[PDB]
């Protein structure tokens, strides 16, 4: 079964950028719910229940027809949020090979940011915006609801290994920003954990 991961910081550790109230609800209510629903669905599937969540979502097609959607939405939710919590932290700086790769594939850090913001802001409805590694090139993509690039293009409309991502579901920013998603996206740059992003980029898997 999956365990709800604890956060690597206090609920107010991202202030004054991301509000403490949202961090707590987002983690203890929303993420908890996705974990519960995924675990409940996997109860009768011992074989799949043993796999790490990141691996399970790459095999949604091998699941019984009646368990595919619930796991896509909830296991996808668990995987995305787990990655999200670890990808946030104040005081980090983009540098090293990751910075070099971004300037290489996007021309500059500013161009990359503009592209990411465009994808995050244009996602209509609920979804996520991502910086992914496809083979050896970095790219920006967005997915609907709780889909992940790890699920494959056939299912999510995108592919690649997630380096970092931003939750653009309204519950992630409504309490503090209401309809102003663009403001939320801007504040994100102040809390994106570049150290974790660099680590994932190095691993590539």
C-alpha closest to that of 60 among 157, 156, 166, 169? 156
Give, to the nearest 10 degrees, the angle between helix 181-188 and helix 109-122.
Answer: 140
3-state secondary structure 178-196: CCCHHHHHHHHCCCECHHH
Task: Build a one-symbol-per-residue string for 28-47: x at contacts with a copy of itself by CB under 8 A, - elsewhere.
Answer: -xx--x--------------
Task: In angstroms, give the least distance from the CB of 36 to Mn ion.
Answer: 15
Backbone Cα Rg of the chain:
17
d(CA 194, CA 192): 6
d(CA 31, CA 7): 11
Breaks in the chain listed by the residue before each, with C–N > 2.5 Å? none
Task: Build a one-symbol-per-residue string for 113-142: x at contacts with a copy of itself by CB under 8 A, - elsewhere.
Answer: -----------xxx----------------
- Work out whether 147 is an interface residue with Mn ion (CB under 5 A): no
d(CA 93, CA 190): 10
Query: Scanning residues 61 to 100, which ones bind a copy of itself (CB under 8 A)?
Result: 73
Find which of Mn ion, a copy of itself, none residue 144 binds, CB within 5 to 8 Å per kind: a copy of itself
* Binding-site member from 7, 13, 25, 49 for a copy of itself (CB under 8 A): 25
The whole-angstrom distance between residue 180's C-alpha and the CA centroid of its chain comes to 20
Query: Scanning residues 169 to 188, which ones bind Mn ion (CB under 5 A)?
Result: 169, 172
d(CA 32, CA 184): 23
- Nearest to a copy of itself of 92, 126 (CB atom): 126
- Nearest to a copy of itself of 111, 178 (CB atom): 178
d(CA 102, CA 110): 10
Find which of Mn ion, a copy of itself, none residue 124 binds, CB within 5 to 8 Å per kind: a copy of itself
Task: In angstroms, give the least distance from the CB of 161 to a copy of itself.
Answer: 24
Task: In angstroms, give the least distance from the CB of 78 to Mn ion.
Answer: 11
Contact 86, 76 (CB under 8 A): no
Query: Scanning residues 143 to 202, which ones bind a copy of itself (CB under 8 A)?
Result: 144-146, 169-171, 174-175, 178-179
Binding site for a copy of itself (CB under 8 A): 25, 29-30, 33, 73, 124-126, 144-146, 169-171, 174-175, 178-179
Binding site for Mn ion (CB under 5 A): 167, 169, 172
């Amino acid at each position: 079964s999956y365990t709800l991961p604890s956060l690597p910081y206090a609920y107010d550790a991202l202030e004054p950028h991301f509000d403490k109230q949202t961090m707590e609800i987002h983690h203890t209510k929303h993420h908890q719910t996705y974990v519960n629903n995924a675990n409940a669905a996997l109860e009768s599937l011992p074989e799949f229940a043993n796999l790490p969540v990141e691996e399970l979502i790459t095999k949604l097609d091998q699941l019984p027809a009646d368990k595919k959607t619930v796991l896509r939405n909830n296991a996808g939710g668990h995987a995305n949020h787990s990655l999200f919590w670890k990808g946030l932290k104040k005081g980090t700086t983009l540098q090293g090979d990751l910075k070099a790769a971004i300037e290489r594939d996007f021309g500059s850090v500013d161009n990359f940011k503009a592209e990411f913001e465009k994808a995050a802001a244009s996602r209509f409805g609920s979804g996520w915006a991502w910086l992914v590694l496809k083979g050896d090139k970095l790219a920006v993509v967005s997915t609907a609801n709780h889909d992940s690039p790890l699920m494959g293009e056939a299912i999510s409309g995108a592919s690649g290994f997630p380096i970092m991502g931003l939750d653009v579901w309204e519950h992630a920013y409504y309490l503090k920003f209401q309809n102003r998603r663009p403001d939320y996206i801007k504040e994100f740059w102040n809390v994106v954990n570049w150290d974790e992003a660099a680590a994932r980029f190095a691993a590539k898997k």
